[PDB]
Amino acid sequence: KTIEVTAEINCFMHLLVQLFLWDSKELEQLVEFNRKVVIPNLLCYYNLRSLNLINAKLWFYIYLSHETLARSSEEINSDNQNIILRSTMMKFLKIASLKHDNETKAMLINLILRDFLNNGEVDSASDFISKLEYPHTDVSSSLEARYFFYLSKINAIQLDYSTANEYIIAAIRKAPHNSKSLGFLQQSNKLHCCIQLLMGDIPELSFFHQSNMQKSLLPYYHLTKAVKLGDLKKFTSTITKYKQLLLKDDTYQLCVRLRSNVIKTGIRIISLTYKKISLRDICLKLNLDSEQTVEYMVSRAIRDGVIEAKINHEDGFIETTELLNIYDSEDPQQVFDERIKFANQLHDEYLVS
Amino acid sequence: MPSLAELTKSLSIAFENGDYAACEKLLPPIKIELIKNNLLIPDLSIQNDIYLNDLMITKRILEVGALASIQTFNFDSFENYFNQLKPYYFSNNHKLSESDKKSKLISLYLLNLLSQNNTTKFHSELQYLDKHIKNLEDDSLLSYPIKLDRWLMEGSYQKAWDLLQSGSQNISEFDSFTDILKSAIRDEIAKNTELSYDFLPLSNIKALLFFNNEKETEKFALERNWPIVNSKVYFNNQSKEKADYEDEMMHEEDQKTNIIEKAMDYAISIEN
Amino acid sequence: TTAAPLLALLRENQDSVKTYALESINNVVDQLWSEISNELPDIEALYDDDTFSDREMAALIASKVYYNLGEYESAVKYALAAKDRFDIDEKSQFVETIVSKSIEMYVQEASKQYTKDEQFYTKDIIDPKLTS
Question: How far apart are alpha carbons A84 and B263 in whole angstroms?
């Protein structure tokens, strides 16, 4: 009897993998059967061990085709299907343990998080961020990369550039397993490219030449040049032409958020310099940016932290310091504190292995 | 519109004829009569908005309530009605919930997110629809908040003042939001004013701030901390008076010391 | 989805709205708990109030909300307080875990209370709700 029930579970999983695009004809036609195998608490019935013979990536592929208004084809307009599925995945989390069975745990949080990013809010996001954090030694290389991929997207919205920058770099490391030389790598790459531009600029595409198609590469070159020259007119046009890409990613907001960095970058390029600075020379520079708002833009610059300078408008001359000299600003101290963390944290994990 | 002998129809007609004060009193007893029954929601049984006890009753009451809430000047009440209505349209239900009233309601929602002082929330709402770019350009009403946000993004104190004043809706019910918005801006410029100062004329500060009274400006110059002689504002330099400062709370060297000292004790514990 | 519709009505501030929002709230608390958390102050306030009519249902919701955060003892206080709408001859995975936590809590008070007097047990002198 026992052996036969485990076998029964292997056969349903197996069937469910087969009836997809992977190993069978077209995923959408097949979706209804794929859904029948999930649904009437046979997924439940699987609890002999944890979900790690079926994976979040798979549950993602069936559910997206069911429902997204572009593959469903506005089949229905309700997220009735996802609400039951999200609840059921939520119901799994409670009985899931974190200490030694977090194979099922991370995967379920991945599926739930994903749905918020697809359609939801950035408000409720905070709780899901905190819940997620669980060992990264339990999940596959493929699964780790996807976990980082989604986390990184979420962190970008909050404007935590730095955190996402680390997770993304770790995400795409090596390739002992697929979806880090495929289509998944290209999706990661686009999101990484965006995060570096957000920080300031990306000025290397060496890696990207070989791991992305030509169609991607052209828009990457156009963006980096616009931002480096500082020229707003080229940048705007780059968004205009590669409108189809920005829509595709489902994140037209990036365009709105980055554009502000470009005008900030332009004001920076020519630094603070001499002890008094002529209005005319600066006016010329600000004219490029916006030419009927010379005084307002320069005022905005100072408050913002683009520049720091001191102004008279009863003389109309700009006074500055020019600092290129880096005395201590807690800078050794900072190094030491960081190192004690770096050595201990690294040290313990390496020691367990 | 006009009564057929039912609560929604009486509310629609009452709104039309003014009587915004009457509508606020009435809205509570109408909500209560519904509240007891299986309503307040498009339901989980919906397949069409054609038949009753679904979306249509709930939407007509919501559209009228939001519009009423602005007239009456209840931002809070407004947040509740917005909170239902934005999900009706598209977030789990349909693709429509909203008619020709749509443009006005959405133009008010874009301004409400802007007015709470979040560019990020303004952007979040647009992404959620995935209908962003077409709606924002096509409707005239929508196009004033997007202009506003853009002008926020870029900088342009002067551009921002201009958009707000020159528009049609500012006269209408953007009016409500004007004071919140103005407050956001007036704090940004004051903090800029002390730090990039050193001297400035009274006439200059007036003009920047776009003040309509000479006397208001003088009240405001004193309020920030800036002491004044006539036709001039003077500052206590570059660290004061309505930055953070003129309110004395900061400046130290004991927190760093502590962290340094803890790091030693933690380092010691590992080595041995 | 969103619980923002349901919560909008809670803020209207009458008896009917409290009861409808409660009976809606019970069903999908667990998935949408995030949004509901911010209104957890209203729920606790309704708790030891009765200007409305929803008290034992309010305690019930609060338990469910607390649960999803990871504050088990906090949820346990309110699960008890839900009283007549909370029953231990009815089990879900949710029910199993807070009964478990309610025993732990009871264990803790009992260790301390035995050391203190060794006929603590001959009367109730500990929390009635737990004892029940």
Answer: 50
Report the residue of chain C nearest A129, measured CA to CA: C34
Nearest to A56 by CA among A144, A153, A176: A144
Query: How far A313 CA lies from chain B's nearest CA (Å)?
Result: 6
Classify residue B89: in a domain, yes or no. yes
**Whole-angstrom Cα distance, residue B103 to residue A220?**
36
Tokens of A201: 């600029």
Q: Chain C: nearest CA to A126, how far in angstroms?
A: 9
- In residues, how long is chain A? 353
Method in brief: cryo-EM
DSSP string of B142-183?
A: HHHHHHHHHHHHH--HHHHHHHHHH-SHHHHTSHHHHHHHHH
Cα-based torsion angle of the residue sequence A279, A284, A286, A287 in order, rounded to the nearest 10 degrees: 130
In angstroms, this model's resolution equals 9.3
Tell me B243's DSSP state.
Answer: B
Number of domains in chain B: 1
Q: Does residue B250 fall inside a structural domain?
A: no
* Chain B neighbours, 3+ Cβ pairs < 8 A: A, C
CA atoms in the 13 A half-sphere facing the CB of C34: 20
Residues 6+ apart with CB under 8 A from A33: A19
Angle between helices B175-196 and B214-224 (to 10 degrees): 60
Contacts of A39 (CB under 8 A, 6+ apart): none
- Expressed as residue numbers, the domain containing B131 is 7-236
In a domain, B96, yes or no: yes
With b meaning 16 or more CB within 10 Å and e meaning fewer, what string describes B13-48? ebbeeeebeebbebbeebbeebbeeebbbbeeebee
What is the spatial distance between Cα B31 and Cα B23, in angstroms, rounded to a whole number?
Answer: 12
Quick check: is B60 in a domain? yes
